[PDB]
Design an enzyme around this catalytic site. Structure first.
Site, PDB file in Angstrom:
ATOM      1  N   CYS A   1     -36.739  42.184 -19.096  1.00 60.08           N
ATOM      2  CA  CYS A   1     -38.178  41.956 -19.050  1.00 60.08           C
ATOM      3  C   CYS A   1     -38.611  41.500 -17.662  1.00 60.08           C
ATOM      4  O   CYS A   1     -38.001  40.606 -17.074  1.00 60.08           O
ATOM      5  CB  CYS A   1     -38.590  40.920 -20.097  1.00 60.08           C
ATOM      6  SG  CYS A   1     -40.345  40.487 -20.061  1.00 60.08           S
ATOM      7  N   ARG A  31     -32.280  40.683 -19.170  1.00 60.87           N
ATOM      8  CA  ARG A  31     -33.165  39.609 -19.613  1.00 60.87           C
ATOM      9  C   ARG A  31     -33.558  39.780 -21.075  1.00 60.87           C
ATOM     10  O   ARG A  31     -33.642  38.798 -21.822  1.00 60.87           O
ATOM     11  CB  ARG A  31     -34.411  39.553 -18.729  1.00 60.87           C
ATOM     12  CG  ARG A  31     -34.124  39.330 -17.250  1.00 60.87           C
ATOM     13  CD  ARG A  31     -33.752  37.882 -16.959  1.00 60.87           C
ATOM     14  NE  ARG A  31     -34.894  36.980 -17.056  1.00 60.87           N
ATOM     15  CZ  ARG A  31     -35.903  36.948 -16.195  1.00 60.87           C
ATOM     16  NH1 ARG A  31     -35.947  37.756 -15.147  1.00 60.87           N
ATOM     17  NH2 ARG A  31     -36.892  36.080 -16.389  1.00 60.87           N
ATOM     18  N   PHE A 209     -40.505  43.705 -23.489  1.00 63.58           N
ATOM     19  CA  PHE A 209     -39.728  42.963 -24.472  1.00 63.58           C
ATOM     20  C   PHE A 209     -40.007  43.386 -25.905  1.00 63.58           C
ATOM     21  O   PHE A 209     -39.128  43.240 -26.757  1.00 63.58           O
ATOM     22  CB  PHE A 209     -40.002  41.459 -24.350  1.00 63.58           C
ATOM     23  CG  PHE A 209     -38.991  40.603 -25.058  1.00 63.58           C
ATOM     24  CD1 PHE A 209     -37.672  40.570 -24.635  1.00 63.58           C
ATOM     25  CD2 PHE A 209     -39.353  39.849 -26.160  1.00 63.58           C
ATOM     26  CE1 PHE A 209     -36.740  39.788 -25.285  1.00 63.58           C
ATOM     27  CE2 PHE A 209     -38.423  39.065 -26.815  1.00 63.58           C
ATOM     28  CZ  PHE A 209     -37.116  39.035 -26.378  1.00 63.58           C
ATOM     29  N   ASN A 229     -47.502  41.728 -16.724  1.00 66.37           N
ATOM     30  CA  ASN A 229     -46.575  40.755 -17.286  1.00 66.37           C
ATOM     31  C   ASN A 229     -47.348  39.731 -18.100  1.00 66.37           C
ATOM     32  O   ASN A 229     -48.503  39.423 -17.791  1.00 66.37           O
ATOM     33  CB  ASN A 229     -45.776  40.032 -16.191  1.00 66.37           C
ATOM     34  CG  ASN A 229     -44.668  40.884 -15.609  1.00 66.37           C
ATOM     35  OD1 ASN A 229     -44.566  41.037 -14.393  1.00 66.37           O
ATOM     36  ND2 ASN A 229     -43.817  41.425 -16.475  1.00 66.37           N
ATOM     37  N   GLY A 230     -46.709  39.207 -19.138  1.00 69.93           N
ATOM     38  CA  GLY A 230     -47.309  38.160 -19.941  1.00 69.93           C
ATOM     39  C   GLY A 230     -48.333  38.689 -20.926  1.00 69.93           C
ATOM     40  O   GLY A 230     -48.331  39.858 -21.323  1.00 69.93           O
ATOM     41  N   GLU A 876     -38.515  12.757 -30.264  1.00 78.64           N
ATOM     42  CA  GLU A 876     -38.485  13.078 -28.843  1.00 78.64           C
ATOM     43  C   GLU A 876     -38.137  11.879 -27.972  1.00 78.64           C
ATOM     44  O   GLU A 876     -37.841  12.064 -26.786  1.00 78.64           O
ATOM     45  CB  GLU A 876     -39.836  13.654 -28.412  1.00 78.64           C
ATOM     46  CG  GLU A 876     -40.992  12.666 -28.476  1.00 78.64           C
ATOM     47  CD  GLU A 876     -42.329  13.317 -28.176  1.00 78.64           C
ATOM     48  OE1 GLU A 876     -42.484  14.523 -28.462  1.00 78.64           O
ATOM     49  OE2 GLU A 876     -43.226  12.622 -27.654  1.00 78.64           O
ATOM     50  N   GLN A 924     -46.189  20.654 -33.163  1.00 80.59           N
ATOM     51  CA  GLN A 924     -46.153  19.919 -34.418  1.00 80.59           C
ATOM     52  C   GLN A 924     -47.422  20.212 -35.208  1.00 80.59           C
ATOM     53  O   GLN A 924     -48.381  20.795 -34.698  1.00 80.59           O
ATOM     54  CB  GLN A 924     -45.995  18.410 -34.181  1.00 80.59           C
ATOM     55  CG  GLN A 924     -46.840  17.847 -33.053  1.00 80.59           C
ATOM     56  CD  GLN A 924     -46.658  16.350 -32.890  1.00 80.59           C
ATOM     57  OE1 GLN A 924     -46.051  15.889 -31.923  1.00 80.59           O
ATOM     58  NE2 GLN A 924     -47.183  15.583 -33.838  1.00 80.59           N
ATOM     59  N   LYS A 927     -50.814  17.999 -33.579  1.00 80.08           N
ATOM     60  CA  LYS A 927     -51.255  18.158 -32.193  1.00 80.08           C
ATOM     61  C   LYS A 927     -50.406  19.226 -31.517  1.00 80.08           C
ATOM     62  O   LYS A 927     -49.595  18.932 -30.630  1.00 80.08           O
ATOM     63  CB  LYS A 927     -51.170  16.828 -31.441  1.00 80.08           C
ATOM     64  CG  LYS A 927     -49.850  16.091 -31.616  1.00 80.08           C
ATOM     65  CD  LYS A 927     -49.717  14.950 -30.619  1.00 80.08           C
ATOM     66  CE  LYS A 927     -48.317  14.359 -30.628  1.00 80.08           C
ATOM     67  NZ  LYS A 927     -48.193  13.197 -29.707  1.00 80.08           N
ATOM     68  N   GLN A 933     -49.678  10.248 -24.967  1.00 83.79           N
ATOM     69  CA  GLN A 933     -49.875   9.177 -24.000  1.00 83.79           C
ATOM     70  C   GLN A 933     -49.333   7.884 -24.588  1.00 83.79           C
ATOM     71  O   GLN A 933     -49.693   7.511 -25.708  1.00 83.79           O
ATOM     72  CB  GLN A 933     -51.358   9.030 -23.640  1.00 83.79           C
ATOM     73  CG  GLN A 933     -51.643   7.991 -22.567  1.00 83.79           C
ATOM     74  CD  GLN A 933     -53.113   7.923 -22.202  1.00 83.79           C
ATOM     75  OE1 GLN A 933     -53.940   8.630 -22.778  1.00 83.79           O
ATOM     76  NE2 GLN A 933     -53.445   7.071 -21.240  1.00 83.79           N
TER      77      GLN A 933
HETATM   78  C1  LIG Z   1     -45.510   9.038 -38.306  1.00 79.03           C
HETATM   79  C2  LIG Z   1     -45.121  10.467 -38.045  1.00 79.03           C
HETATM   80  C3  LIG Z   1     -44.645  10.811 -36.791  1.00 79.03           C
HETATM   81  C4  LIG Z   1     -44.274  12.119 -36.512  1.00 79.03           C
HETATM   82  N1  LIG Z   1     -43.806  12.416 -35.254  1.00 79.03           N
HETATM   83  C5  LIG Z   1     -43.432  13.702 -34.948  1.00 79.03           C
HETATM   84  C6  LIG Z   1     -42.962  13.990 -33.674  1.00 79.03           C
HETATM   85  O1  LIG Z   1     -42.885  13.096 -32.833  1.00 79.03           O
HETATM   86  N2  LIG Z   1     -42.582  15.275 -33.354  1.00 79.03           N
HETATM   87  C7  LIG Z   1     -42.673  16.271 -34.303  1.00 79.03           C
HETATM   88  O2  LIG Z   1     -42.335  17.420 -34.022  1.00 79.03           O
HETATM   89  N3  LIG Z   1     -43.138  15.984 -35.570  1.00 79.03           N
HETATM   90  C8  LIG Z   1     -43.524  14.702 -35.906  1.00 79.03           C
HETATM   91  N4  LIG Z   1     -43.993  14.415 -37.180  1.00 79.03           N
HETATM   92  C9  LIG Z   1     -44.082  15.526 -38.199  1.00 79.03           C
HETATM   93  C10 LIG Z   1     -42.809  15.562 -39.038  1.00 79.03           C
HETATM   94  O3  LIG Z   1     -41.707  15.296 -38.199  1.00 79.03           O
HETATM   95  C11 LIG Z   1     -42.581  16.911 -39.729  1.00 79.03           C
HETATM   96  O4  LIG Z   1     -42.604  17.940 -38.762  1.00 79.03           O
HETATM   97  C12 LIG Z   1     -43.597  17.243 -40.823  1.00 79.03           C
HETATM   98  O5  LIG Z   1     -44.895  17.324 -40.281  1.00 79.03           O
HETATM   99  C13 LIG Z   1     -43.576  16.212 -41.944  1.00 79.03           C
HETATM  100  O6  LIG Z   1     -44.229  16.710 -43.088  1.00 79.03           O
HETATM  101  P1  LIG Z   1     -44.473  15.742 -44.349  1.00 79.03           P
HETATM  102  O7  LIG Z   1     -45.776  15.008 -44.143  1.00 79.03           O
HETATM  103  O8  LIG Z   1     -44.537  16.557 -45.618  1.00 79.03           O
HETATM  104  O9  LIG Z   1     -43.344  14.746 -44.451  1.00 79.03           O
HETATM  105  C14 LIG Z   1     -44.371  13.110 -37.484  1.00 79.03           C
HETATM  106  C15 LIG Z   1     -44.847  12.761 -38.746  1.00 79.03           C
HETATM  107  C16 LIG Z   1     -45.217  11.451 -39.024  1.00 79.03           C
HETATM  108  C17 LIG Z   1     -45.732  11.117 -40.389  1.00 79.03           C
END
Ligand SMILES: Cc1cc2nc3c(=O)[nH]c(=O)nc-3n(C[C@H](O)[C@H](O)[C@H](O)COP(=O)(O)O)c2cc1C
Ligand code: F3S
Lengths: 1483, 410
Positions: A1, A31, A209, A229-230, A876, A924, A927, A933
């Site tokens: 790619c 790639r 790709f 690209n992209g 993390e 996640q 967010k 932060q």
């Molecule tokens: C207090 C809290 C903190 C979390 N922190 C993270 C996070 O730092 N990174 C992440 O990927 N998911 C995070 N999650 C999401 C969970 O790890 C998981 O991915 C999922 O959303 C949990 O689903 P549930 O509410 O059915 O238990 C967090 C969830 C909660 C409740």
């Protein structure tokens, strides 16, 4: 790619360049990943100039005229012949009527047998058509215009007929070959390429790709002109705007041919084809290729202070008439005799090119594409962002971007035009009037305000200067299912970027953002002069009352204003048609601004949903081709959230006037609350709303409000397909849903209730972000919470069953509650089904941030899950290495799932090797497109030590993965992690979204073993409230789409899907398993078991139960126990087993994917709106396999490491004895050292070996991510040049990079490293003998480096270590740098001041003797290891060098260091001194 | 409610300080010709609503009258008379051949539409055409009024008088026969006044620290003129906050990035409120923003040597007294904001002559008039131990009273 080109500057031609281009493609092949079989070609092609010599030698029956006076066509036909000859006759007729003479036709010989099975089956026929030139066509530009006219007419006729054929290219200087071929297959297939008669000047190439496994010959590029690209994230608004301007384009060069060329773009075409069509139209219109490229892809012209006035005026002028096309992209176009190369406004892709003594530019994605003589290489430069690498074959020189840009800018008096023609709308300061309605409560209830909404969303904005935060992400039922009346806004969920593009940041990357908005009517784009810019321009989309009144009162004849009453009585269709009639009448009269006002609304007239009204108006205007002549301003009361604002701007609104919010603030200020003045409050609210809009934009990656305005980045959840097609065309909807009549009934009900309101003078409490009795239902109500807690603490099963019943029945919570069992099957006894011990091995705890949680809670979770035998997880925030040894009591706190987030906080050799599986947090549930932060107040020393940062320093986690700019980079990172831990399984974390099936297929091709789909219902430690409520989709749709797409593509038997998010019951687990889940994640429920009361205050760090707070006082109140979690898991398993007995399923893989056992419950039909949903999308089972059997074969074998390095180094590592070897490395070898580093770390650990124990030598070009995860004691002498991501995740050791031995020019001035270096490293050294790339040392956290110049955004998010730049520095240096030091050498102090970002850095001059000695020692080692002339000269002139050095250090870092040094001098222990300094700093 | 009484009281004070008898006060307290008319109008829906008009000529002893027109929904007779007297004071201060006046209409331009505004203005002229003419009255732009309304009024007066009268009404578009620099007149006036005040007080303009709160057209043009002259700007503010830099702020870049509204504050950067902006160190302070800002609390915090009230009465009596006690030069708003009237007068002269001047000539004439007026008022205010506001009012009333005495109405 990637891309590539091997051009001879002076214009001389040979077959050697074509052969070298084919070799370059073959090398680039590595790639890409693997599809169904390795033989299949995901897409590749090659571009050349017209080979007149070969044509004259081979055709033998065409009287070919001179070089420039004819054109060559390339057409793809189906296997049939009747349609073939019909189209041939029709094309000849087109040419004859257009007047050109057809010379003849030819068939390209092809070797079909040299191709994979699928491409052989889809093999289309090829014929080349020769076009003649008439005497009238004096100029080749006119000839190309006529050829383009012919091609577009033929395409129009073809689409009208419905046939399937495509014009690969039709031009007099470019002929394109492409298809579903691997590069080693292309030469064999196109036997023409093997002839020794071709003579060309340049040879562009490209390899795709193919994110999906079902591509077509037409889609694969090189396109007609350019290679792309992209991906482009503005391709819906782009097409809408282009179609709008289509009806209004007028020019003289095309004459009346615009009627023929009315369809200028392919609606069904992909991003690359659409871009090629638009670019070709623009350049044929009579603009230079460079000029149109600059118009389409502008630099950051707003917020940037490093730009010349001419350039700023140029871009201000062109942004006023054409919007920018944002997204990761590396354009490389052609026009026969000129070439160019560009990067996007953010430079998110690599581009490193060579130059030789024979004028052979080699521009490609990586460095070691072809073998080149180091004695002949002249320049090793990088195509920096905002720099035009332009080549002109006839002149035979690399024309400098600076002069090209200067003369383009000076070609016209843009500065004078902007200065003169701008319109001023200065409001009268004496016309003030604080408006009031006297029906504030009535209007607020009508528009749906709540006291909760006010006190939790409006006052906090003013108080904090930003959108208020939250935690415990939304669990309330969707608007479509909620019984309570809901506004239309809740039905629309925001979107974000997961793969193929990063979510760009806003606060730190402010220089790239642009919030300029233009109001009025655009002029003639093709011949623009002063009337494109005689328009109003705004700084923010939002408006104040005074501003809105000024706009309405403007009476300039060219800029008129009209007010349209957006109201209805009974018929929504009648209302919309009447609104269209007013709009078109006003346009005919000549207005340019429309005001959609909800005012003057009484009990008989109710308001249309503003989103629906704006979308309908925008679609009608676009369809009728008048949108460019008007400007739609919206004044709706229901506009108070950033979500509502962003929806309005995205779907068309030019500006918003939240008059209702302003009146509410007036009322509050009059009452006494919110003591701040009215004007200041209004200004702060406007600024905060603009900041929120910028954040929402940054989530997706669109960096321009103008682009986002057209872009439709929302996904309706519960709107009928017919309604979407009618009014929201282009929006994605899965289940259909409610209709216009239902929406009207809802609006009328709300309006009637609000205007009745004859009992009280108060607003009912809201229930969006908190639970209030009698309000909107929530998943975790107190009944469920305390029932679950009591059952778990008592170990009683009846109480748990009652909790399950209460949680599931009595309400509609989620989509999965609409599914019910048939009930007519063969039940099996509980003793005949799989056991609970087998059940519990398929559970996970979900990522749990150590900063968000307390140590006691985290260890309890880990111990419980490890004892149960599942797989715990670590957030993390890294993990203290002390947890990798079981305790004497038998407890094992080790986490089986190590997360690799954007922060890369605790990433280390030991931390990675001592694990069982690895995740990649792409996003996640709460967010996705945002980072985080952790200010100084909340970052305690006991967290900072674990996270490898200074105590009491505000850490920043960038939103995107800076190592992930596309799916190719994702595959590279997956390979890197697999090499780091060969004995682990790689995992990725996605979020349900439209196209998630395509993304999952792409990831499976990228060879990710496990894919996790997390719904937006999941929780989070902290995130903005609107991101909590209106982001993502329920995981059911995502899982269904991913399963269907994977098993249709045939890769479902190569990955292991998972699920998480409000999995509260075994019924939910069974629903997920039927939908196609394999392992499940429970995070919110374990917290409730431990003692969490769903108080939603984690962000506040003041948990009363001491479950998510770092304070020791609160931690002392903890009461959890792993036994409760064990009981919860056992009860879930037992209930699931009971349902297995009920359903008569014998084994997991046997049941999985059996969606035929699901049917809609009668309660959904009973529901007054939920009955209109279409569930066949989820209830559908294509034939295939539905379980993971294959091992997902990686390519760990045949790597240079295992082949050569290890076999002679096992003895060295095991005996702790020194060993030296030399190796030849080519670009194919990717990592080259991570395996040895992992072995060392596993054998010894964090301590490592004595300094310089293993001394590996290397030569030639290195591969991507070279020397990643290298531990302490290693040393990688790389006597050459490398590619991106050098030293990724370094954990000690040295890295010495020196230019080649045959290179004698200024190696310190020629770039020698890729874009990103040392991302997320923790400790080590480095000595780079040359310039670095953009975003150098992105997340350095202790690594000392020495470089001679760096790219842009260097030292972005450092949190420690030091950097010593011996040369210039790019703009936006130290953007967000919250720690560490940077001894940046410079001469022009003021220019350095201007270049640096002044937000969070303090500058000094070296005075400390210890600092001087450290720098001297670092330079001494640099010279001793590199022999750099710049370093030697600096050592010689140390006396001047010490004066000329410049030091940079953040305020908080400096203050913390001073305080801790003072305490240590006073003579206090390290821990107590750190605690005292932290308390003093964060009192 | 108190505007008319305040105007009468200040006029009485000025006349008492002059020493003229009470007959001049009796004649000048009240405008000599107030007309109330009703204007029929046809709406888009076809219904007819009647708008109440107004017109007041405070005096015409000097010569033809002049006044603006505001489409303000709360315009009343008391306000109209007060504004007429205020405009007469402006004309007297600037030494123009105008007497003074004001007009207005009770309407709402917000809900009013384009064609409806056209018809409204046309009906207004048809109503008051009798007592309005080149030697009797001269409308001019004002609140909720601009070039399009001026052009409609000119077109209709041409229709009714049967001959072209471009000099009938000022503030016309450039093509119709307008005057250049119609937008920077206030900025040029304040620039001349600040220059002369600095010269008289000994403050060197070169390197003088300046603060300009309120960044509309007036603020932008004033900042550009100060930068061209040489004085450094160390503060700007707008509806979204302000900035601060003791060593300049790149006024060229600020004007280049200036948007339609004049907003200049960054997005992700903290801003300074005007309350703290006023306290920043500076030689000259120029409040051109919301009224009622300088009061007792900030009087002790103000630090500028010269304060120019480009706005309309931004200060109060207590603040004026405190500044006078502190010996801080206070430029009256009547003289600070007379650039608009001066440029309108130049436009009228150009139309009457039939020949149009150039930007340089307008610049020179405007600066000459402003410097002469400022020098005269400064000399009088230093000859008589009084405040500059009292000196301005006294000088303005002197010409009107003396002309009336010559013409023998008293
Ligand atoms: C207090 C809290 C903190 C979390 N922190 C993270 C996070 O730092 N990174 C992440 O990927 N998911 C995070 N999650 C999401 C969970 O790890 C998981 O991915 C999922 O959303 C949990 O689903 P549930 O509410 O059915 O238990 C967090 C969830 C909660 C409740
Ligand atoms: S929501 Fe958070 S603040 Fe404590 S009570 Fe639950 S962990």
């Amino acid at each position: 790619c990637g891309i590539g080109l091997y051009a001879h500057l002076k214009g001389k031609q040979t077959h050697d360049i074509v052969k070298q281009g084919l070799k370059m493609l073959c090398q680039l092949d590595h790639r890409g990943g693997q599809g169904s079989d390795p033989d299949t070609g995901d897409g590749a092609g090659l571009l050349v100039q017209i080979p007149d010599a070969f044509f004259r030698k081979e055709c033998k029956n065409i009287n070919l005229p001179e070089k420039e006076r004819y054109g060559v066509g390339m057409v793809f036909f189906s296997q049939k012949e009747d349609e073939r000859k019909k189209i041939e006759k029709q094309i000849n007729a087109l040419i004859e009527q257009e007047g050109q003479v057809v010379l003849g036709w030819r068939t390209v010989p092809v070797n079909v047998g040299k191709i994979g099975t699928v491409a052989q089956k889809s093999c289309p026929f090829v014929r080349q058509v020769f076009i003649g030139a008439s005497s009238d066509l004096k100029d080749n530009l006119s000839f190309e215009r006529k050829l383009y006219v012919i091609r577009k007419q033929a395409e129009n006729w073809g689409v009208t007929e419905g046939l399937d054929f495509y014009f690969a290219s039709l031009s007099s200087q470019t002929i394109v070959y492409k298809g579903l071929l691997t590069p080693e297959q292309v030469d064999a297939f196109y036997s023409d390429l093997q002839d020794e008669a071709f003579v060309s000047a340049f040879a562009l190439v490209h390899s795709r790709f193919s994110t999906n496994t079902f591509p077509t010959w037409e889609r694969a590029h090189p396109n007609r002109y350019l290679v792309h690209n992209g991906e482009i994230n503005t391709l819906r608004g782009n097409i809408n705007w282009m179609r709008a301007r289509e009806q209004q384009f007028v020019s003289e060069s095309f004459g009346e041919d615009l009627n023929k060329i009315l369809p200028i773009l392919n609606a069904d075409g992909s991003d690359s084809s659409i871009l090629d069509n638009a670019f070709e139209f623009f350049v044929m219109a009579g603009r230079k290729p460079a000029h149109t490229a600059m118009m389409l892809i502008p630099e950051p012209w707003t917020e940037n202070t490093h730009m010349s006035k001419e350039k700023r005026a140029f871009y201000e002028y062109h942004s006023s008439l054409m919007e920018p096309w944002d997204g990761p992209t590396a354009i490389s176009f052609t026009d026969g005799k000129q070439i160019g190369a560009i990067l996007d406004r953010n430079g998110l892709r690599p581009a490193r090119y060579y130059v030789t003594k024979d004028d052979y530019i080699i521009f490609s994605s990586e460095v070691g594409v072809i073998e080149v003589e180091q004695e002949n290489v002249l320049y090793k430069n990088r195509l920096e962002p905002g720099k035009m690498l332009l080549i002109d074959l006839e002149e035979g020189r690399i024309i400098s971007d600076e002069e090209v840009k200067t003369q383009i800018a000076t070609e016209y008096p843009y500065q004078k035009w902007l200065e003169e023609e701008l319109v001023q709308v200065n409001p009268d300061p004496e016309s003030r009037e604080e408006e009031q309605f006297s029906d504030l409560l009535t209007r607020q209830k009508a528009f749906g305000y709540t006291y909760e909404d006010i006190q939790k969303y409006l006052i906090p904005v003013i108080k904090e200067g930003k959108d208020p935060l939250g935690s415990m992400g939304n669990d309330a039922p969707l608007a479509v299912l909620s019984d309570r009346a809901q506004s239309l806004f809740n039905y629309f969920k925001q979107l974000f970027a997961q793969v193929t593009n990063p979510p760009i940041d806003a606060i730190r990357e402010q220089l790239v953002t642009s919030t300029m908005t233009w109001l009025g009517a655009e002029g003639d784009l093709l011949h623009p002069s002063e009337r494109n810019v005689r328009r109003i321009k705004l700084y923010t989309p939002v408006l104040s009352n005074e501003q809105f009144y000024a706009l309405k009162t403007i009476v300039h004849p060219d800029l008129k204003s009209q007010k349209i009453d957006v109201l209805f009585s009974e018929d929504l269709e009648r209302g919309l048609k009447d609104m269209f009639t007013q709009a078109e009448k006003a346009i005919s009269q000549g207005v340019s601004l429309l005001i959609l006002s909800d005012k003057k609304m009484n009990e008989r007239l109710t308001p249309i949903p503003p989103l629906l009204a704006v979308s309908a108006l925008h679609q009608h205007l676009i369809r009728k081709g008048l949108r460019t002549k008007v400007s739609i301003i919206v004044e709706s009361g229901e506009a108070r959230e950033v979500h509502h604002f962003a929806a309005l701007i995205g779907y068309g609104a030019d500006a918003i006037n939240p008059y209702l919010a302003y009146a509410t603030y007036k009322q509050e200020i009059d009452e006494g609350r919110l003591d701040i003045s009215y004007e200041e409050a209004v200004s702060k609210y406007g600024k905060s709303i603009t900041e929120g809009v910028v954040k929402v934009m940054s989530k997706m990656g669109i960096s321009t409000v103008q682009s986002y305005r057209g872009a439709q980045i929302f996904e309706a959840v519960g709107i009928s397909r017919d309604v979407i097609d009618r009014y929201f065309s282009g929006t994605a909807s899965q289940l259909g849903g409610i209709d216009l009549q239902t929406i009207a009934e809802e609006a009328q009900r709300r309006h009637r209730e609000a205007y009745q309101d004859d009992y009280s003078k108060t607003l009912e409490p809201g229930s969006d972000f908190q639970w209030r009795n009698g309000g909107e239902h929530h998943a975790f109500n107190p009944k469920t919470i305390h029932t679950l807690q009591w059952a778990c603490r008592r170990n009683d099963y009846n109480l748990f069953k009652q909790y399950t019943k209460a949680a599931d029945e009595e309400r509609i919570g989620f989509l999965r509650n609409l599914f019910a069992f048939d009930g007519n099957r063969k039940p099996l006894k509980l003793e005949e089904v799989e056991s609970a011990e087998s059940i519990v091995k398929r559970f996970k705890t979900g990522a749990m941030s150590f900063g968000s949680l307390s140590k006691e809670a985290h260890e309890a979770l880990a111990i419980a899950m490890n004892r149960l035998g599942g797989k715990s997880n670590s957030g993390e925030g890294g993990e203290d290495p002390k947890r990798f040894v079981p305790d004497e009591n038998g407890d094992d706190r080790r986490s089986a799932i190590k997360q690799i987030a954007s922060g890369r906080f605790g990433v280390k050799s030991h931390y990675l090797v001592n694990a069982d599986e690895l995740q990649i947090k792409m996003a996640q549930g709460a967010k996705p497109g945002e980072g985080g932060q952790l200010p100084g107040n909340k970052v305690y020393p006991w967290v900072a030590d674990v996270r490898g940062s200074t105590p009491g320093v505000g850490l920043i986690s960038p939103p995107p993965h800076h190592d992930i700019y596309s799916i190719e980079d994702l595959a590279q990172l997956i390979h890197d992690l697999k090499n780091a831990n060969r004995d682990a399984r790689i995992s990725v974390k996605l979020v349900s979204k439209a196209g998630v099936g395509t993304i999952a297929a792409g990831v499976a091709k990228a060879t990710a073993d496990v894919i996790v789909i997390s719904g937006y219902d999941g929780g989070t430690g902290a995130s903005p409230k609107t991101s909590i409520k209106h982001t993502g989709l329920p995981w059911e749709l995502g899982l269904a789409e991913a399963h269907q797409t994977l098993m249709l593509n045939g890769l479902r038997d190569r990955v292991v899907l998972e699920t998480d998010g409000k999995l509260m019951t075994g019924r939910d687990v069974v629903m997920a398993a039927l939908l196609g889940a394999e392992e499940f994640g429970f995070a919110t429920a374990p917290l409730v078991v431990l003692g969490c009361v769903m108080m939603r205050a984690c962000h506040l760090d003041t948990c009363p139960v001491g479950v998510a707070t770092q304070n020791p006082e609160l931690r002392k109140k903890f009461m959890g126990d792993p036994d409760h979690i064990v009981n919860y898991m056992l009860f879930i398993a037992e209930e699931v087993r009971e349902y297995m007995a009920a359903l008569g399923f014998k084994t997991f893989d046997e049941m999985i994917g059996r969606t035929d056992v699901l049917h809609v419950s009668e309660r959904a039909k009973e529901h007054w709106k939920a009955s209109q949903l279409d569930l066949s999308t989820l209830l559908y089972q294509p034939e295939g396999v539905r379980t993971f059997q294959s091992p997902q074969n990686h390519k760990i074998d045949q790597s240079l490491d295992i082949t050569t390095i290890l076999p002679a180094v096992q003895e060295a590592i095991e005996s702790g004895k020194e060993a030296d070897i030399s190796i030849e490395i080519n670009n194919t070898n990717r990592v080259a050292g991570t395996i040895t580093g992992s072995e060392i770390s596993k054998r010894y650990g964090e301590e490592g070996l004595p300094e310089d124990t293993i001394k590996l030598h290397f030569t030639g070009s290195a591969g991507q991510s070279f020397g990643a995860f290298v531990p302490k004691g290693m040393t990688l002498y790389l006597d050459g040049d490398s590619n991106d991501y050098v030293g990724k995740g370094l954990s000690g050791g040295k890295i010495i990079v020196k230019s080649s031995e045959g290179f004698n020019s200024a190696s310190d001035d020629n770039v020698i490293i890729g874009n990103v270096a040392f991302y997320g490293a923790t400790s080590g050294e480095a000595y780079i003998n040359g310039r670095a790339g953009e975003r150098f040392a992105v997340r350095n956290s202790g690594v000392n480096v020495v470089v001679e110049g760096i790219g842009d955004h260097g030292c972005e998010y450092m949190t420690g270590g030091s950097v010593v730049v011996l040369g210039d520095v790019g703009k936006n240096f130290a953007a967000g740098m919250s720690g560490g030091i940077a001894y940046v050498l410079t001469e022009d102090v003021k220019a350095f001041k201007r270049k640096c970002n002044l937000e969070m850095i303090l500058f000094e001059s070296l005075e400390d003797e210890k600092e001087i000695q450290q720098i001297k020692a670092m330079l001494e080692r640099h010279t001793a290891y590199t022999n750099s002339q710049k370093a030697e000269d600096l050592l010689d002139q140390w006396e001047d060098s010490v004066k000329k050095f410049v030091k940079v250090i953040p305020k908080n870092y400096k203050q913390m260091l001073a305080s801790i040094e003072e305490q240590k001098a006073a003579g206090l222990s390290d821990e107590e001194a750190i605690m005292f300094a932290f308390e003093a700093n964060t009192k | 409610l108190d505007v008319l009484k305040s105007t009468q009281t200040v006029i009485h004070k000025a006349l008492e300080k002059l020493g003229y008898p009470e007959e001049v006060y009796e004649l000048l307290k009240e405008p000599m010709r107030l007309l109330t008319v009703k204007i029929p109008v046809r709406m888009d829906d076809g219904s007819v609503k009647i708008f109440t008009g107004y017109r007041a000529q405070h005096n015409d002893s000097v010569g033809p009258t002049k006044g603006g027109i505001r489409f303000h929904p709360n315009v009343t007779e008391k306000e109209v008379k007060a504004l007429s007297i205020w405009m007469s004071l402006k004309c007297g201060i600037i030494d123009l051949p105008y007497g003074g006046g004001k007009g207005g209409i009770v309407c709402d331009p917000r809900d009013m539409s384009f064609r409806e505004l056209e018809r409204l203005s046309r009906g207004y002229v048809r109503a008051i055409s009798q007592i309005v003419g080149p030697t009797k009255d001269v409308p001019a732009p004002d609140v909720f009024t601009n070039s399009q309304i001026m052009a409609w009024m000119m077109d209709e007066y041409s229709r009714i008088d049967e001959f072209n009268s471009p000099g009938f009404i000022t503030g016309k578009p450039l093509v119709l026969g307008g005057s250049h620099g119609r937008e920077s007149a206030t900025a040029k006036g304040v620039t001349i006044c600040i220059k002369e005040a600095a010269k008289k007080r000994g403050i060197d303009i070169k390197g003088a620290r300046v603060v300009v709160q309120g960044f509309g057209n007036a603020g932008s043009y004033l900042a550009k003129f100060m930068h061209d002259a040489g004085a450094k700007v160390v503060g700007i503010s707008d509806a979204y906050g302000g900035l601060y830099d003791p060593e300049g702020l790149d006024i060229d870049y600020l004007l280049d990035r200036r948007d339609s509204f004049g907003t200049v504050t960054k997005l992700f950067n903290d801003t300074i409120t005007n309350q703290e902006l006023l306290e920043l160190d500076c030689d000259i302070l120029v409040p051109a923003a919301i009224e009622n800002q300088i009061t007792e609390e900030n009087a002790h915090n103000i630090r500028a040597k010269i304060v120019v009230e480009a706005a309309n009465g931004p200060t109060t009596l207590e603040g004026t007294k405190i500044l006078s006690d502190r010996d801080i030069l206070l430029v009256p708003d009547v003289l600070a904001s007379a650039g608009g009237v001066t440029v309108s007068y130049f436009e009228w002269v150009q139309n009457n002559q039939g020949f149009y001047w150039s930007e340089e000539e307008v610049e020179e004439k405007l600066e000459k008039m402003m410097v002469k007026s400022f020098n005269n008022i400064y000399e009088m205010a230093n000859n008589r131990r009084i405040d500059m506001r009292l000196a301005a009012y006294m000088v303005g009333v002197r010409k009107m009273a003396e002309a009336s005495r010559f013409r023998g109405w008293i």
